[PDB]
Amino acid sequence: EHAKAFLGLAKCEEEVDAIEREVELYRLNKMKPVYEKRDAYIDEIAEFWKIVLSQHVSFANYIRASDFKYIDTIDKIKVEWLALESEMYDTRDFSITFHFHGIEGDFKEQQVTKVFQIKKGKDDQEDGILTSEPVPIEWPQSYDSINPDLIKDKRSPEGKKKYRQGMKTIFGWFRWTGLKPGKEFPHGDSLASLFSEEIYPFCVKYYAEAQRDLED
Amino acid sequence: EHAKAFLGLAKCEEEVDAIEREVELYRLNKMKPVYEKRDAYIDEIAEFWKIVLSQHVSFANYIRASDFKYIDTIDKIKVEWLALESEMYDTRDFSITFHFHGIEGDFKEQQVTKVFQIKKGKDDQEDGILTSEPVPIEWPQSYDSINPDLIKDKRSPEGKKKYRQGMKTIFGWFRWTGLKPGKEFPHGDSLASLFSEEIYPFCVKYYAEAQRDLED
Amino acid sequence: EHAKAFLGLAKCEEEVDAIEREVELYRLNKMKPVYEKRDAYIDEIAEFWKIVLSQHVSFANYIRASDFKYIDTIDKIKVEWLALESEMYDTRDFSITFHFHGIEGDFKEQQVTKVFQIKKGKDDQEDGILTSEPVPIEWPQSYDSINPDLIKDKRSPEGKKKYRQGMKTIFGWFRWTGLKPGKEFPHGDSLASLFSEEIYPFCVKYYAEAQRDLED
Amino acid sequence: EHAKAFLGLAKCEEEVDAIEREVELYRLNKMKPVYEKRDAYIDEIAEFWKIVLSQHVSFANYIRASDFKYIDTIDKIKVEWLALESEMYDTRDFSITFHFHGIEGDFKEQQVTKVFQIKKGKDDQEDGILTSEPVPIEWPQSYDSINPDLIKDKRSPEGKKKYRQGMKTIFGWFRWTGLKPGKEFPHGDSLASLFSEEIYPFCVKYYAEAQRDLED
């Protein structure tokens, strides 16, 4: 009845995995209402996101300094976890919504939402990896020369170069999917994790740290 | 009403911290019953712990190979989380219970339990650190020469050396407290964490890995 | 006897330290002529440095992406080791010389050299740490608002902020000394090491890697 | 022109590689005589190696604490670099010689030397990796049950287990070659590097540190 034991143990492991999911759902449910309250207070501080995003340590490593002109117009960010809507979603799946104030003559005021979900390929310990769907955004006027929608050739030496430059901008990240390795915005996956795991949850601590450095 | 906002945010952080604790209690409560069931099956495999303990990668780094003779007689381990009994305990606080089969003429069959709880010293980010109380154990006959209870001098060059050698054995770990840095069993705290965070929860995975290496 | 031995060993360590210096001098002397030859070939490839600097992995982490506009105009870099000129210099001491092509009406074409030398503070094991002297540079026109030489106040909340922003640019690095911890360009020392230990010696390997990726 | 330049740079890299070898030979030649002098003084301190080997931080991670009984009898270690004898040897190639005092009726007093040399497999960047030849050693009497030369079966479940246990002892390391990955003493290569790069060169610093702790 070592047999019975082994069979029993295998089933217990499965129950452990089920428990971890139940625990995570509990956490996400309880946190949802507090995030909504927090977000409401955030809306009362006009320059909040601009400050936080410029303060983060590694965020800046992902995007050309050129983009910051536009990143500075972000005045709202909201993350929502998809597993709260349906149990068919992995606990790590989420949507992220940005609002931009825009810039006269260059960049339209607009709201955009992107969705990220996990998938597995089997083969290798792989807990599974993030994927996303491209989502439309109206690019800044000045980015017309590296806009993939305006470049006619993108197959010529010059066109190919312009194309790759655009895909390396923040706007190229919006059409990231994780399904064409080496052909999309680099590390779109790690950027997404930065948001769900660091930036959205601890933004206030980042803001405080930034306002602290104003004094010394 | 940035003021109101800031005050509101500070309170929300506090609620976050409360939620994390509530989440942890939920996890520990749900897991308790599964651990009891698992443990029951473990009891049916006589050499389980001996195998697991010899299999772990880093456990061996903590104790003289000499001790393994006695570690091999362990036939039962149980961890219990104190926060389940009272909310005055930190979520990380726990008791650990060992049973030894013993060895004829050298080591008595016996059961011992040690308790670990967190404390903070303030000063430094310190999430707080583990502490424990010494607990009595009957040492193996052959360890008489480095037994702190039998060494008369322990202040002479020879006595001091014998004393330090005994405190570096597994049995010296049992009187570890974490309150006399540099004078007790080295890294008693990290060893304790090995048990609560790795060895007890994932013992089955370690056992399987060990039985897997039997084949190649 | 044991005495004699210990004195002998102490002297041998001293001889080891002397040998390490002798070995380093040999390396630097033999390398000097090859660097000069190599540099001559480098001068024939106009966009060399621009490409290499944009290619390095961690260089970008040190400076605002804004600065790259100007970093891209660097068309010459030369490192020389001061220990070759005098034995009073530590083997690690060096001068670094930059030439910038400039940008009409924003940034003047110019050549600048900075010197770095080791010093010790004693106590802490410290092999000793880098120091430098501030060296004058004509800042880009567009950097006028965060130029420490043009800010009148720099003590008001706005002036202090503008001042700190300028000191965090590449140009602020040029007045780094390592003598006012926390008040100068962050990690000026690690940046200097990047140049002497990685960028200058292995630039060609970085360039190749960059040209390798340009098609992919 | 550009052609000429590229050919010139390729040749300069080759010269760099040649220089590194020349520098290394210089270092090894100058150090040889100091090591001989130092070793002579080391021979006058009977318990030197025992203390040093028990003191090293990570050495212990490689071998069963059981082996220390025998490691404690080492009273002499000598490393020599083969590149000093012939230029056909890589700078990293070396021989290592141990002398053991032995233990009456368990372990014979004896001297053993092993040789390590680099080889390349091509493709993977591989600077090339260490290889060695098995060298005969008379095993301790008590290790008879896991001695590969005494196990008759080593193909039965018990024999296979005994065999693998022996190959994981320090004595199994002596027949390591690096030519049968996963079937020989684990990480024999990293252990060899520990000796040539850390233990032999800095033994004195380790000894001092150990004598420093002996009072604390």
Author numbering:
A (entry chain D), B (entry chain D), C (entry chain C), D (entry chain C): 10 to 225
From the article:
Vacuolar Protein Sorting 75 (Vps75) is a histone chaperone belonging to the Nucleosome Assembly Protein (NAP-1) family. However, Vps75 is best known for its ability to stimulate the histone H3 acetyl transferase activity of Regulator of Ty1 Transposition 109 (Rtt109) in Saccharomyces cerevisiae. All crystal structures published to date show Nap1 (5,6) and Vps75 (7–9) to be homo-dimeric proteins adopting characteristic ‘headphone’ folds, in which a long N-terminal helix self-associates in an antiparallel manner to form the dimerization interface which is capped at either end by a globular domain. In addition to the headphone fold, both Nap1 and Vps75 contain C-terminal acidic domains dispensable for histone binding.
While attempting to crystallize Vps75 in complex with histones H3–H4, we inadvertently crystallized Vps75 with four Vps75 monomers in the asymmetric unit. Upon repetition of the asymmetric unit, two distinct tetrameric assemblies of Vps75 are clearly observed in the crystal lattice. One tetramer is made up of two dimers of Vps75, each composed of a copy of chains A and B, which together form an asymmetric ring-like tetramer. The second, symmetrical ring-like tetramer, is composed of a dimer of chain C and a dimer of chain D. Both tetramers are related structures, with the latter most closely resembling the conformation previously observed in solution. In the symmetrical tetramer, the antiparallel dimerization helices of one dimer form a saltire-like cross with those of the opposing dimer (top middle). A ∼30° dislocation in the register of the two dimers allows the symmetrical tetramer to transition into the asymmetrical tetramer (bottom middle) and vice versa. In the symmetrical tetramer the ring-like cavity is open at both sides (top left). However, the transition to the asymmetrical tetramer is also accompanied by a closure of one side of the cavity as the globular domain of one dimer occupies the cavity of the opposing dimer and vice versa (bottom left). Amino-acid conservation analysis shows that residues mapping to the asymmetric and symmetric tetramerization interfaces of Vps75 are well conserved. Thus, in the tetrameric conformation, dimers of Vps75 have a relatively large acidic concave groove between the globular domains of each Vps75 monomer as a result of a straightening of the antiparallel dimerization helices.
